[PDB]
Design a protein around this ligand. Structure first.
Ligand SMILES: Nc1ncnc2c1ncn2[C@@H]1O[C@H](COP(=O)(O)OP(=O)(O)OP(=O)(O)O)[C@@H](O)[C@H]1O
Ligand SMILES: Nc1ncnc2c1ncn2[C@@H]1O[C@H](COP(=O)(O)OP(=O)(O)O)[C@@H](O)[C@H]1O
Ligand SMILES: Nc1ncnc2c1ncn2[C@@H]1O[C@H](COP(=O)(O)OP(=O)(O)O)[C@@H](O)[C@H]1O
Ligand SMILES: [Mg+2]
Ligand SMILES: [Mg+2]
Ligand SMILES: [Mg+2]
Lengths: 85, 457, 104, 49, 47, 52
């Protein structure tokens, strides 16, 4: 149960992304998985290592098949459905 | 004036008057197989290996293995140039299967990775290959449009020389409207088939900031890579020589004042089939060889052995000079190559061998290889190259007098006639014209035998 | 990707269409080698031609080569393969006309 | 250089300088009746035999 | 081969010339004596 | 020059004194429009009495 959130800088998109992640994770459901936030600007290399293109990105690696979600996570219901199991 | 970055391709560079603009984006349009990827690859390779500018190759479709293997055959070593980091390859691939879009996204990782590569390699040149896959992957079109407009602005903003590969499409020179964006330089590559013969052409559609060539220039991809020998680069600056050359026929040599035709001149030998044009050319080559000089005999009609045993009847022992290493035979059919590769091979081997007499027999064999204009362009390029090198060119042409519009340049003209009169055939020859000297105006009948070509009294 | 990944040599058959060399955009995918086959009629005579549109990684023929399907199958005798390497012989042949033979 | 797989067709093989690339996909385009199916069939048959 | 001129209208000049050149080259490589008969109307067909 | 020197016409003398001009331009060097433009421009600039 691990989730990674790739963002770049104190951007409105990334800030809203992490805030919305907080909201969906807490109000919608319990703490089933642990979140880790990585800001790409300091480590551009990690962007290549994880093959990231469009900010912001939310990637789950718990299941064998990877799954990514691109954007700021504005739609709570869609984010929850994409992250539900 | 404006800055310009050479691309290694001498013909393209001199056509553009320096090369692509420096610090501006360039668009390379053309259907699949035209050579846009190779164009960008040699761009980067030549920039790194000749002008000391690091390069970055951002590919959106092809993997680094494919990118390296494509140019591996051309003689470049992308493995070594990356193994040394002079060119940095970034395979920026996006898979829409595991992508779900919620909210607004910016192609920030693209910029971060490209900046990381640029700082790693100290790059000054950048190539963007297959940027249409970027549009095909993501769903929102406006976001992608804005993102790469920002990307082009950012590339200009930090001042890198960028070349973009784009497909042609159906309506305009691009199918994704990258012309809207890149107008500093547009180069269209075309691959057209006519009469079953396919040729590759290059055109500079729009180059903003200075003059350039506007015609369609046929180019070739060879072991070296891109090669462009435009017909507009030929100039009439030919250093003349006051020495004379020996044809090998004493009577013909004495017929003209000075002992022979001026050295480095273009000599045409015209006549009907069986007149003896090849015999005269062989006489010229053998006479040049006997003096210790090198000679080449390009033949588009006969094999080396057949020519040998044809001339051995006339006594010219071409085997001796070929075996001692002073005479070269090619024996190449007109249809073996295209016109561009015929020109390129002739030029390359002439430069490598550095001979003193080149005999092309016959120049009329290229009649149906293409249109009259293309063959004339090839012949003019060959003649100008030989004259600039100061080599004596002996061209043999068949007669049916004016033949193909290439007599227009020849310095000397020798017509060989085999006429039927009084129920029997007689041979004759005469100098139709000999520039810069006085010569006999008699139709001297001759008779070929074992001793060679001999003019009757 | 999986076929390349386990390393098999694969040949894909695709229809032409109307706009490009393929109607389903398989050119987007396969660029290692593209071979276009055409069957064109001129003056009521129909001929079959083959062309290598794009072969990535090395040189190749670029012209349109007329080919034939016969009992053996595909047969291609390109006119670009002919070379001027002909071993000559010093013997003579008899035409059957003594006067013509002696004339030379 | 790169690997190449002969396809039995001598003319096509010598045109391609060895044949189709080995380990890579090849596309055969053409309208109905051009001979793509037969091309693939002889490819396989010659490769096996 | 009698006559090589019979193929005049079978196709364009280039195609017939290609066929004739291939035949001649094949015969010469095999070292066979080729006797081609052509009709006259001198140069006939560029072969 | 060395073709005419055989006929005795010493064009070098007049070219060197500055009364004769030679262009020596190939037909394919320019397009027709630029051939015309260059000819007109140089003729106007030099103001000669005989153009061959
Ligand atoms: N020993 C010899 N004695 C007399 N004539 C000879 C001798 N050897 C060759 N010839 C003549 O040379 C002619 C061929 O000359 P050559 O090959 O130079 O002609 P060409 O103009 O180059 O011909 P083509 O149009 O076939 O290229 C033969 O037809 C024959 O008439
Ligand atoms: N070693 C080589 N010699 C001659 N031509 C080559 C060589 N390698 C590749 N080519 C040419 O390059 C072409 C493909 O070039 P590329 O630019 O990669 O594709 P595209 O033109 O579709 O962008 C092939 O169609 C082939 O004619
Ligand atoms: N025994 C044969 N001899 C000559 N040609 C044949 C023979 N069998 C099939 N053909 C040719 O093969 C063609 C069909 O080939 P195929 O590749 O199966 O179809 P397509 O070209 O539509 O893929 C026919 O149009 C025919 O000309
Ligand atoms: Mg390409
Ligand atoms: Mg000859
Ligand atoms: Mg079929």
């Amino acid at each position: 149960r691990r989730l990674v959130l790739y963002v770049a800088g104190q951007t409105p998109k990334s800030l809203a992304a992490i805030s919305n992640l907080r909201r969906i994770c807490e109000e919608n459901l319990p703490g089933q998985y642990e979140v880790e936030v990585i800001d790409l600007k300091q480590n551009p290399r990690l962007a290549k290592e994880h093959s990231i293109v469009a900010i912001p990105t939310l990637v789950r690696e718990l299941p064998v098949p990877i799954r990514k979600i691109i954007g700021d996570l504005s739609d709570k219901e869609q984010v929850l459905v994409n992250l539900k199991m | 004036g404006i800055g310009k970055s050479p691309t290694g391709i001498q013909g393209f560079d001199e056509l553009t008057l320096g090369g692509l603009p420096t610090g501006r984006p360039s668009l390379v349009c053309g259907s699949a197989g035209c050579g846009k990827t190779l164009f960008a690859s040699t761009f980067l390779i030549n920039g790194v290996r000749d002008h000391g500018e690091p390069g970055v190759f951002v590919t959106f479709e092809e993997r680094p293995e494919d990118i390296v293997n494509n140019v591996a055959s051309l003689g470049f070593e992308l493995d070594k140039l990356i193994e040394e980091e002079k060119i940095a390859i970034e395979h920026i691939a996006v898979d829409p299967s595991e992508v779900a879009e919620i909210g607004d996204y910016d192609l920030e990782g693209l910029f971060l990775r490209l900046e990381l590569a640029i700082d790693t390699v100290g790059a000054k040149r950048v190539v963007l290959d297959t940027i249409e896959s970027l549009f095909s992957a993501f769903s929102n079109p406006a976001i992608l449009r804005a993102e790469i407009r920002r990307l082009f602005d950012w590339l200009k903003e930090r001042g890198l020389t960028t070349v973009i590969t784009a497909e042609r499409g159906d309506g305009a020179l691009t199918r994704q409207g990258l012309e809207e964006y890149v107008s500093d330089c547009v180069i269209l590559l075309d691959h057209r088939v006519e009469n079953q013969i396919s040729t590759r052409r290059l055109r500079i559609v729009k180059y903003r900031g200075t003059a350039h060539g506007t015609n369609e220039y046929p180019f070739l991809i060879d072991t070296d890579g891109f090669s462009v020998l435009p017909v507009s680069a030929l100039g009439l600056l030919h250093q003349v020589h006051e020495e004379r050359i020996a044809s090998g026929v004493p009577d013909l040599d004495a017929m003209m004042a000075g002992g022979g035709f001026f050295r480095g001149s273009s000599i045409l030998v015209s006549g009907v089939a069986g007149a003896g044009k090849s015999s005269l050319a062989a006489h010229f080559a053998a006479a040049a060889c006997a003096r210790g000089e090198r000679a080449m005999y390009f033949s588009f009609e006969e094999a080396a052995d057949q020519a040998v045993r044809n001339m051995r009847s006339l006594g010219l022992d071409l085997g001796r000079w070929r075996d001692a290493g002073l005479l070269r035979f090619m024996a190449t059919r007109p249809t073996f190559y295209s016109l561009e590769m015929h020109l390129a091979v002739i030029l390359r081997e002439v430069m490598r061998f550095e001979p003193s007499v080149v005999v092309l027999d016959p120049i009329s064999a290229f009649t149906e290889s293409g249109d009259r204009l293309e063959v004339q362009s090839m012949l003019l390029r060959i003649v100008d190259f030989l004259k600039n090198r100061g080599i004596t060119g002996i061209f043999t042409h068949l007669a049916h007098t004016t033949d193909a519009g290439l007599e227009e340049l020849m310095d000397g003209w020798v017509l060989m006639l085999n006429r039927e009169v009084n129920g029997e055939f007689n041979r004759e020859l005469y100098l139709l014209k000999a520039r810069g000297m006085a010569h006999s105006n008699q139709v001297r009948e001759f008779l070929m035998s074992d001793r060679g070509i001999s003019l009757l009294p």
